[PDB]
Structures are given as structure tokens and as C-alpha cells.
């Protein structure tokens, strides 16, 4: 019952972020897009505010082991926690499409930078 407020306080924090994602547009190569995408990914990671999400959700967890409740606000809690995980399903999956897409994004640029450094080094010797 107190945990109703606890798990509502994070439930408001998380959907809001998805409303912020659609708050920003979408990018699909033609002109001035690397200098756009370095910033897009950096506002996208900032949009998630995960340092507070992982904090307040871990706090909502910590009471569950540090404190217990016998058969009262512990028996419809399954009706509560069922009410709040068709969504972390979406979120943790949403944490990854950016992350797997960002990991590769770092690597293309760093490897092209390696090749360009080798090129200009060769041309330094020309």
C-alpha cells in the first residue's frame, strides 16, 4: 500500500521518458549527419536519466528484503507488480537497441579514424 506509492513514483518516471523519446524526432547520409548523430545519441542517453531510474527502483527493491509484510500489502503485491511489468519489458529492451546501435556506431568512426590517421601519416611521408 505504501509500496503502491513507491511503485507508482517510478511508474510515472519511466513512461515520461518514452514520451520524451517521441518528443524527439527520428534520423534516417546526405548532408551533415555525423555532427548531428554524435549529439542525437548524447541527448538520447541523457533522455533516459537512468542514474535516477536505477536508483529509485533499487530503493523500491531494498525495502522488500530489509522489511517484510506478512499477508497484507504482500498478497495483492502480485496484483501490483503485475501492473508494472508489461513496461520494464519495453524499457530494458529500449535500453538495448540504442546501446547495441551505439556500440557499433563508436566502432565505425574509430576505425575510419584509424585508417585516416594511417593515410595522413603516409602523406606526411609524401
Amino acid at each position: 500500500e505504501d509500496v503502491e506509492q513507491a511503485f507508482r513514483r517510478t511508474f510515472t518516471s519511466i513512461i515520461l521518458s518514452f514520451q520524451k523519446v517521441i518528443g524527439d524526432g527520428i534520423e534516417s547520409t546526405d548532408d551533415n549527419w555525423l555532427s548531428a548523430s554524435f549529439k542525437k545519441v548524447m541527448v538520447n542517453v541523457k533522455l533516459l536519466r537512468s542514474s535516477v531510474v536505477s536508483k529509485n527502483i533499487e530503493t523500491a527493491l531494498s525495502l522488500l528484503k530489509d522489511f517484510d509484510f506478512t499477508t497484507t500489502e504482500s498478497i495483492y503485491v502480485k496484483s501490483v507488480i503485475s501492473f508494472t511489468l508489461p513496461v520494464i519489458t519495453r524499457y530494458y529492451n529500449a535500453m538495448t537497441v540504442v546501446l547495441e546501435r551505439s556500440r557499433i556506431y563508436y566502432t565505425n568512426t574509430s576505425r575510419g579514424m584509424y585508417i585516416l590517421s594511417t593515410i595522413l601519416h603516409s602523406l606526411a611521408k609524401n
Partner: protein, 342 residues
């Protein structure tokens, strides 16, 4: 605290030898796993040692290559003296002289080892170097969950049916998001540049090959300026940047960052190497280097959250498997009792 430390450390590896090398790394990783032990309370000084080990460990297989192609002369010689020392018609009195002579022949041959072993660890650094973890989820916390969820209780602040559809539809839209790659362009330049530098007869179309040289070196910088692009005071040397870098420690990005650490070896050679396109480009990459560097601390903290929430989604998906009710604090002690007995 930091710059002095990386500089004082760089001697400890640069002042060594090829057989006096791996012991240094296996001595220093002890210190790296020691600072973790005190805690991530101290997470400014272990990040250093991580990046330095990632830097010098990059060189180790090429070091071992040298001894492996170097020992082959010596293994053969010791085999030859062994089969020389192979005895037939035993003849005790002849054996002793064959022993004390052989010790003289061994003495020079180990010396050759010491000529390989005392070789400078520096020169391999001085030559530099010439040239996915697959995460996914559609996790399976399925029912338990039903219209049973509608039991509420203490709430006055909701429908869950369509919003679950709203968020996966958002996931469809954002999963379709994608940016272009970059390595294709550097590889096109790689192709045409190796063509120009390889298509030279050097015979006195020398002027025409110079025309194409000018064309490519102009076009490259133009199209580089076409898409995107004061940092001198911080980004001028390895220790200036490496003593403040954000590392990767969690094993999602310690397979996808050596293409960064490789940039560090040739970079001093670029600085020593230094028409005006040269001045544009050498300064051009520093902004790109900064764009590649600055990202690392944000994404490190992002990942540091990510593993926790995965490990806790795991817990709560196991919390769906409740059968009784909350009894863990009373259980919190005896679990440690039995685990102590494990």
C-alpha cells in the same frame, strides 16, 4: 595525482625487456585487482591502470612473435648437442670428457637467449603498429499476470492495455532509427590512396599521377568538411588524455574499443611527422578525437546502470514466482549460515 602516475608507470614498462615484460603485466594486474578490492569508492585510479593495461597488452602478441621466431635457431642447436651427447657403447671413461666439453658449448648458446632476452622493450613501442558481444532481449516475464491485476486498493491515479501497445509501437519506431556508417568512406580513401601510391612507375604521367594526387587530397578534405567538423591545451599527448579517460570495465565494450587505443600509438608519430591541407587535417582530427573521447564517461555510466537494472529485472521476474509471502529478513541470516558452511 594522475598524470604523474601514468608517466612514472610508463617507465616501468618502457624500461624493460621482452622476457622481462609479461611478469610486469601479471605484477600490475595484481595491483589493479587490489584497488577494486578496497572498492569502487576509489574509481579514479583503477580506471587508469585498466587503460594502461589495455594499451600495453595490445603489444604482447607481437612481442611473443619475436621470441618464437628467435628461439628456433637455439632449440635446434641444443637438440644437435643432445643427439651429439646421445651415447652408444657406453664406455664410462669417455662420458666425463663429453660432459665438461658440452657445458662450454651450452654456455654461449644460453648467451644468445640473453641477447634475445635483454633486448630493449622500447623499440617495439617505437615501431608502433602498422595496421560483437551480441546483446538482445525480448524477455519472458509472462504470466500469474491476468485481470487479477484489476484487484485494486489504494489507487486513484489507470488503463494498461493500450499503453503497453503504445510503448512497443514506440519501440518499433525507434528500433527503425539508424545513422549511416563511416568506415566505408575511409576504406574508399584507403583503396584510392593505395592505388595512387602503388600505381607509381617512378619513371621519368608522373605529372598526371601528381594531378590525381592533388585531386584526391583536395576531395578528401572537402567532403570531410562537408559533413560536420579549442582542445590543444588538453589533447596534445597520451598522458594528458589517458590520465583522464573514461574506461570500459563491463564486458560489453571491452571488445569494441581497440580501434581507439590503436589511435594512440601512431599519434606521437603524427605529431613528430608535422601544404595547408596538412594543417587543416592534423587539426581536423583533434575535434573528431574529442568527439570520440568525451562520449566515454556518459556511456560508461549508462552501462553501469544497465547491468544493475538487468540483474534486478531478473530478480523481479523471479519475484513473480512467489508462492508464499515476504520472508527474507528473517531468512537473511541463515542463508549466510549455510553459505558459510558451503
Amino acid at each position: 595525482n594522475a598524470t604523474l602516475l601514468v608517466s612514472s608507470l610508463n617507465l616501468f614498462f618502457s624500461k624493460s625487456t621482452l622476457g622481462e615484460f609479461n611478469a610486469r603485466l601479471d605484477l600490475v594486474k595484481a595491483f589493479y585487482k587490489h584497488i577494486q578490492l578496497i572498492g569502487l569508492r576509489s574509481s579514479k585510479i583503477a580506471g587508469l591502470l585498466h587503460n594502461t593495461i589495455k594499451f600495453y597488452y595490445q603489444f604482447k602478441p607481437l612481442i611473443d612473435e619475436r621470441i618464437t621466431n628467435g628461439k628456433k635457431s637455439l632449440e635446434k642447436e641444443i637438440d644437435d648437442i643432445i643427439l651429439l651427447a646421445s651415447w652408444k657403447d657406453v664406455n664410462v671413461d669417455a662420458l666425463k670428457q663429453s660432459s665438461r666439453k658440452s657445458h662450454n658449448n651450452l654456455y654461449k648458446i644460453v648467451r644468445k637467449y640473453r641477447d634475445l632476452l635483454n633486448g630493449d622493450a622500447k623499440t617495439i613501442i617505437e615501431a608502433g603498429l602498422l595496421y560483437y558481444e551480441d546483446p538482445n532481449l525480448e524477455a519472458s516475464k509472462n504470466l500469474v499476470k491476468e485481470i487479477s491485476t484489476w484487484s485494486m486498493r489504494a489507487a486513484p491515479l489507470r488503463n494498461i492495455d493500450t499503453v503497453a501497445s503504445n510503448m512497443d509501437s514506440y519501440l518499433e519506431k525507434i528500433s527503425s532509427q539508424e545513422f549511416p556508417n563511416f568506415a566505408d568512406l575511409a576504406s574508399d580513401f584507403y583503396a584510392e590512396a593505395e592505388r595512387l601510391r602503388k600505381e607509381t612507375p617512378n619513371v621519368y604521367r608522373l605529372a598526371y599521377l601528381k594531378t590525381q594526387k592533388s585531386k584526391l587530397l583536395g576531395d578528401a578534405l572537402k567532403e570531410l568538411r562537408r559533413i560536420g567538423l579549442d582542445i590543444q591545451k588538453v589533447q596534445s599527448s597520451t598522458t594528458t588524455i589517458l590520465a583522464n579517460i573514461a574506461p570500459f570495465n563491463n564486458e560489453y565494450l571491452n571488445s569494441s574499443d581497440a580501434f581507439f587505443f590503436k589511435i594512440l600509438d601512431l599519434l606521437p608519430k603524427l605529431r613528430s611527422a608535422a601544404v595547408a591541407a596538412i594543417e587543416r587535417g592534423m587539426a581536423l582530427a583533434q575535434s573528431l578525437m574529442f568527439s570520440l573521447i568525451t562520449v566515454r564517461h556518459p556511456l560508461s555510466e549508462f552501462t553501469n546502470d544497465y547491468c544493475k537494472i538487468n540483474g534486478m529485472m531478473l530478480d523481479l521476474e523471479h519475484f513473480t514466482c512467489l508462492k508464499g509471502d515476504i520472508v527474507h529478513s528473517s531468512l537473511k541470516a541463515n542463508v549466510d549460515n549455510v553459505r558459510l558452511f558451503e
